[PDB]
Amino acid sequence: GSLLKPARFMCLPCGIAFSSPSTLEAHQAYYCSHRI
Numbered sequence: 001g002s003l004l005k006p007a008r009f010m011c012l013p014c015g016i017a018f019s020s021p022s023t024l025e026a027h028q029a030y031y032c033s034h035r036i
């Protein structure tokens, strides 16, 4: 962990704690704001 290795499944800036790594990518994909 530490760096170059994700180990946290919770979007503090959104206030929604997930329970899966791939799920996080799903949130950051089209759930977290409008990222282009």
Ligand SMILES: [Zn+2]
Pocket: 011, 013, 014, 027, 031, 032, 033
């Ligand atoms: Zn978010």
